[PDB]
Amino acid sequence: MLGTRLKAARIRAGYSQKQLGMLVGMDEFSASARMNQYERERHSPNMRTSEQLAMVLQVPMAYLYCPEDELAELILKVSSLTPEFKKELTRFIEQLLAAQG
Amino acid sequence: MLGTRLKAARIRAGYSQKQLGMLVGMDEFSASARMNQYERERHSPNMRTSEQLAMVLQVPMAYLYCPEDELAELILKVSSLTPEFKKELTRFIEQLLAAQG
């Protein structure tokens, strides 16, 4: 998991390294430590843990695995769209892919 | 890594389990085997390997880690957009996020 994305997702949610750490079942005393290893990428969270982080952070798992800065930003935006707006988006994108390019 | 996404990305690119397997430096005799384990999720490709798969498959790493079917489909579409169209997209999305919802 990309540390930057994990850190960026923790800041947006307003969680301290310890808070996020405990929100996923970590031991208090080492919570903030375990998290730092992840955000430093010194440690890699397995799929199970990744799903927990995404749910808590309220961000798509894909975001935490999106190295492309532009795309990631888009992945968070499209996700924050309401069902009604999400429909308008796809409609517009399809139209463009149809002009094609 | 989500198997379905890995398999779906291999089919779209037109690669056989062995081809994809070797395209990332695997031993011929076990290439197709190693890949099946990944697509079955019986084996998890580390970040390094994930980057190799994404590059070869020509799909954003995020896609291979996008459990939400709707989003994934969108992640592939937006990625297939030309720089000129990619600008139009963001412009439209921003406008919507501004109506806000």
Numbering used by the authors:
A (entry chain A), B (entry chain A): 1 to 101
From the manuscript:
The crystal structure of BswR was determined and refined to 2.3 Å resolution. While 101 residues were visible in the final model, the last 13 residues and the 6×His-tag in C-terminus were not well ordered in the electron density map and thus excluded. The overall topology of BswR monomer contains seven helices, of which five form a compact helix bundle and the other two assemble as extended C-terminal helices. Consistent with the prediction, our structure reveals that the N-terminus of BswR comprises α2-turn-α3, a typical helix-turn-helix (HTH) motif for DNA-binding (in which α2 is for stabilization and α3 for recognition). Based on the gel filtration profile during protein purification, we found that BswR exists as a dimer in solution. This was further confirmed from the crystal structure: the two monomers with the V-shaped arrangement of the C-terminal helices intertwine together to form a homodimer by crystallographic symmetry. On dimerization, an average interface area of 1438.7 Å2 was buried, accounting for 20.8% of the solvent-exposed surface area (6923.4 Å2) of each monomer. Furthermore, dimerization was mainly mediated through hydrophobic interaction, which involves the residues Leu71, Leu74, Leu81, Phe85, Leu89, Thr90, Ile93, Leu97 and Ala99. In the dimeric structure, BswR exhibits an uncommon large area of dimer interface, which is formed by the extension of C-terminal helical region (helices 5–7, residues 61–101). In particular, BswR shares the most similar structure to C protein Csp231I, with a root-mean-square deviation (rmsd) of 1.169 Å for the main chain.
Here we identified a novel transcription factor BswR, which is involved in the regulation of P. aeruginosa swarming motility and biofilm formation. No discernible motifs were found in both proteins, but bioinformatics analysis suggested that PA2780, comprising 114 amino acid residues, possesses a potential xenobiotic response element (XRE)-type DNA-binding domain at its N-terminus. Cumulatively, these results indicate that BswR positively regulates the transcriptional expression of the small RNA rsmZ by specifically binding to the promoter region of rsmZ. Further structural analyses suggest BswR functions as a homodimer, which uses positively charged helix to fit the major groove of the dsDNA for binding.
